[model samples]
Target: KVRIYQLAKELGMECQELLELLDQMGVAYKSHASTLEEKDAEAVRELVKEQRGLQEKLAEEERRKSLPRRPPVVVIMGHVDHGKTTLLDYLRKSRIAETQHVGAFEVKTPQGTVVFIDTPGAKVADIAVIVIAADDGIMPQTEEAIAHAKAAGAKLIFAINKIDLPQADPEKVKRQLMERGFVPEEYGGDAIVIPISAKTGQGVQDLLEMILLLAELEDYRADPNAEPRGVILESKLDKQAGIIANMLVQEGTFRVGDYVVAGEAYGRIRAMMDADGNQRKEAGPGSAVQVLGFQELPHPGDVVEWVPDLEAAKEIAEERKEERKAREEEEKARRPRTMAELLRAMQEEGRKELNLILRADTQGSLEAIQHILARESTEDVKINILLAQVGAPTESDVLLAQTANAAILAFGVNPPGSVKKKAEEKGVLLKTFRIIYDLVDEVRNMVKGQR
Candidate 1:
């Protein structure tokens, strides 16, 4: 199943334009929100390509990717004045902790790669290390760090820093956090705690070993052959190099000359470099590199995706740019709330947000897509998921979407003709999708379109 609006967006056309083409092609649809069969969608892809006068690039929409073990991403959480820098400096100075960029670094252990986010867009932290000063124990920032780590559902490890000081006491620090459930293993608890003096490099090796061991148990993995995708940690305009971006290749492999789209920015990789500023032809999953080639500056946390060529990348980037320009006006009139209520809410809070109602055939797919959707939310665009349920879109769903001014997304399910008619009558945007990738891609693109 695929939605007309989503298909049109992917094809870089208006929904009405795609609908007219579908009508001419003898395809039936209830509304813009109506579903299309996989075979029909493929035909549409072909028809669009033929209309563009392009030769067949490939038959497979997505290639099969074999899963392989990949490095784990670790995030250090603590206060702004915490010893994170000292600890990181010690680690980098001690061994092969090659700096990938200012945003992140990789520690090459005998076991494998352990990539650590050094505090710029730690968006995908597999494990979080909470550093508490042995002297300070737990502070307000430490509490916030613990709460955030818990919210992200990352495995937590405690590091009691500054043990070299006479006043520094690891036992007291452990006892202080025990009330918050971070009890030490020595005290018969599961929480692993390592005491270290970042200033003197005491127990840092133990901390490294612990991280690798936990990563081993967790079995972090990714497919090196999967479509290349990553998050931009930082991007800036350089007088000498144009737009320079620091990015981590989270999945698959990135090669020089590959076309990529990051947020509203798109370009071919002209040059790539590791943290040491050494030229790299290709970088695999977990490799962080400085990339030169984005036409525009991609915001930190914007996801970068591999595209087949510059034409498609440019088309997508332009589509995103245009949508962003027009979205505010379109959303203003239909903003999903009554004018008066919207004013009240806007005065009470802020207004920049997107609301969504989701329906999926199974709980598994619902949860999986929800996770991906949650990750799509960034500083620029916030998502307000009004509803998520397992099943078909019912009258209640349509009514809720109409009232909330939310777009409905149906995955692996179809809305009945009656419900579709009601939605159309209410002028609601209801999208149904069979392919999870298309669904996710549409949502991510929509988010990026928020500028």
Candidate 2:
């Protein structure tokens, strides 16, 4: 099976482009990370390859005519200063660790054949700019930045920032760049260096012009006639819109009312808002616009496509649904676990983080108790919540705790008589509490025992 992202790579296109192309062909995919039948992947390979030839040919003709080109989806990276915070003004909306609730940002750089962003536009190196401090000169992090840009194969540009400082020395910064394999044009290399400061708008406009020139040389192009495809950078349940996808248009142009599908979610574009929250009639390549009218909240990295018709979209969706069930069944058959194996998992004899299973009558109580446990943890043995859910503790819950080598920490709902017997038989431990304070005290007591 080929992942959608993998298929995108084989066609030398971004996931959004392949997904856009895939939607046109009535291939319904859940996400860029979703896997598909090998034959379907093979079919997509051929489909996009044919389109690539067409896109490239048209792009070359456009270059000759000096026609309008697509904007570059640039990802700024750094060696170590957390410097990238200054870049990726591109907007959309929302993270993994925190995705369980409200979300989070930032960008990743590509090396060789592997790029981390998963979105097509940010995959290849359209541009990589390094921000250096004039006062700091070439610090340890600067050396790393040069090697990073070289490895990424981007047209390396530099912004000698913070020139307004009394300690600023732009010439020293340039001399260092020359020594570091990036010879500036003034010093006679292909590299472009401009001294600027984010503080006072010093040389930023010139920097922008140079960036545009490089983009022109690169000739970034996306077909406007192609079916609209974008990526879900973020999405949420908007009170007014039902569902909103913070979409970054990667290819083609479309207006409100175009039927759109992102992953398993489908809808028409009811409205469009740029990152600044202004409503617009249309969107084009490289614009990060907040999109309205998804049937469901799409995942952060979902591929968005404008489908031709509802019936065709439904057919592909049905096929994908069946595929998902089959995959789930296969996964279950392959990785079945038993309580006996879980019991053996529990006997961590030495110093280690204490694994714990928590259960309460509701999410809030469970969350509150878990928080208390986490805070009670000692430096040597931190409390780890392996699984925390609502409802009565059962044999399966005991098995899960056993598998994690965790003790079941019950709250609110009192245990059944046989629950203790089952846990004892499975070599699982249990500690119950009517109050969070007792729970915290008991966990702390256990931690001291382990030490």
Candidate 3:
């Protein structure tokens, strides 16, 4: 037997959250402090295993029911001057091109279908291979490559390249990999680090095999019948061709006559061409091809989609410039998301108060203060708390208050900083205390414009 509060902690839930969880699971319970019989507690535990409320089951089911497998759209990108191009050249020539660097083809080999995306700039991918030179150590570009690959959420692989030089040392690179927390497969970790000389053909075949292995384990699946959508890898206005978009298809088979919506660039697919400049009537996921139709030059990384017709494409295209400006202006006018935006908003609208910074463990004291303050702001004016967080104020918060019309409010914790000179120089007033009702009454008095 367990009390409701005890059971809640076991399920990793709060008091109200546990109540809601009970209601969700059809388990009847009175309150947080009530006791639970053994069977009742067991039932709650079973439901909680799926989730505090089994919330993810539906989403997981939907995913499980979706998609037919397609070739991995490999995108290779990494630090500049670290032989990315050379790697691509070697991989392309070696019959193994990969990277947000993506290459794919229907080869009559063990790994049948592989398509590669050759992008000159940042593009999303299923897998990202960070290229480090055996000749050159991990440079800033190498780190940037790693950062972007992670940010894009692609599975990572390390390519220790340029092993042909006399100083070519895979063993030295091996030590650093261990230092950087990369556990190689030999020592019981699944680090896919391949040493290649994009200089020589060493491990080129093995590199390709590793990518194939990673994709299979990843279950890299995509719906081949979904609406076609993906990123524009390269866009240019060819004098002879008019407008061209070298697109990497993420899903669906894009045919020759499909209408495309690529930001301001929308048009019917007049024609399409593949990697070797071969004409293609259609292409599916993981395929990279040149699309020879656009109303204008679409920017690289601009989302490309095949809409129903030219009109649908136009509808989306027609809504951006003014929409962009309106969102920009509204954002400029509203309570700033950051202190700078708040300052600039004040500069333009010329003022309002309770432009406070709120910090607390949110569903606790934070929600109560937020609710009480909501009663004061009419549509004509919003006395806003421009920022909120889970901790004490930062220096930037003081910088924000120094310029904007705002103060700091702390609940359940004290004022977080004493960059004393910084706070004073910036004119920040941090008032911390307990008792939400007391704080509310104090603010109610201030609404009459009192000091």
Give me the candidate number with maximum TM-score: 1
Estimated TM-score per prediction?
0.59, 0.46, 0.57
Winner on TM-score (2 vs 3): 3
Q: At residue 249, give the lDDT of candidate 3.
A: 78
1 against 2, candidate with superior TM-score: 1
Task: Give the TM-score comparing model 3 with the true structure, all chains together.
Answer: 0.57
lDDT of each: 0.76, 0.64, 0.68
Extract clashing residue pairs from model 2: 14-120
lDDT of 3 by residue, 107-154 (tens): 323774666556553344777787878866666676555544543446
Range of the 10 consecutive residues with the lowest summed lDDT in candidate 2: 107-116
- Per-residue accuracy of model 1 over 1-451 as CA lDDT, tens digit each: 7888898998888888889989999988899999998798788888887856542333222232225678888889887656898888775653443334646777777877788876544356778888988888888788767655654556778887877888887777878777655557787866778887778778878788898998778767776767898888788888887999988888878999999998799999999988766899898888778899888889887888899989999888888888887887777775565455645544545445788888876543455566566756743457788877777887666788767777788777888887898877866777877555467667876665434
For model 3, what is the alpha-carbon lDDT of residue 402?
A: 66
Between candidates 1 and 3, the one scoring higher on TM-score is 1
Instruction: Give stretches of model 1 more than 4 Å off.
Output: 1-66, 94-102, 119-122, 319-327, 330-451
